[PDB]
Amino acid sequence: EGEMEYEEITLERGNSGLGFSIAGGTDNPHIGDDPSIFITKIIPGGAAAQDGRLRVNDSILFVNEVDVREVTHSAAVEALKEAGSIVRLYVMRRKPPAEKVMEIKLIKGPKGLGFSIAGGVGNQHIPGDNSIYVTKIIEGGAAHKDGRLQIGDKILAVNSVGLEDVMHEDAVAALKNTYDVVYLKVAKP
Ligand SMILES: N[C@@H](CCC(=O)N[C@@H](CS)C(=O)NCC(=O)O)C(=O)O
């Protein structure tokens, strides 16, 4: 965590470009006196989002064979626009904070587990991430009464069924196909 890491990410240009916005350069450094080109936004439903590797705050070092470590903002946009259909990026990032994985046992109340979900493949809740997220916890519901499950939590598994890269519909189906006592694997940020 916090340690610098490097990654090769190749993207195929969609109808709406590569699906990310950038800032920085020697023109207007984004962090102090650091002239690096930074990802500021991952566009929902775009190429970078579907590929799920690129992250906000990644520094682009190379675009194909073009060195963008110390260039202007304009020279960066040009390099990306001119890179063709298949774009080879070499990036650097500080490793993100690790998440707490936790198994939670819930007994249904009169109205179920007491929480709602969003996310899924082709229905991303955060751009670049196919995970199933908790979006609402119902007042006085089972989850609320437990006190562990929170907004923004990830559901990784329902009993023995994993929810890694599944459709939203499949996540709802897994939660429905349960008995009264449900075991959930959850990730907390
Ligand atoms: N491990 C290889 C590949 C790592 C890599 O992707 N290198 C960067 C710069 S050190 C690069 O120029 N990649 C884009 C390219 O394929 O030319 C190397 O030593 O160059």
Set out the domains of the chain in order of their start, with CATH numbers. Answer: 1-92 (no CATH), 93-189 (2.30.42.10)
What gap in Å lies between CA 152 and CA 135, rounded to an integer? 6
The structure was resolved to a resolution in Å of 2.0
Our mutation pick for probing the ligand 1 site, out of 5, 6, 8, 68, counting the most ligand atoms within 8 A of Cβ, is 8
CB 181 within 8 A of CB 105: yes
Closest to 102 (Cα-Cα) out of 160, 178, 167, 185: 185
Method: X-ray
For 46-73, b where at least 16 C-beta lie within 10 A, e where not — what string? Answer: bbbbbbbebbeebbbeebeebebeebbb
Q: Are 36 and 24 in contact (CB under 8 A)?
A: yes
User: Residues with beta carbon inside 6 Å of ligand 1?
Assistant: 8, 62, 65, 88, 90
By alpha-carbon position, which residue is closest to atom 7 of ligand 1?
A: 90
Cα-based distances in Å from 129 to 19, 50, 111, 124 = 14, 8, 29, 6
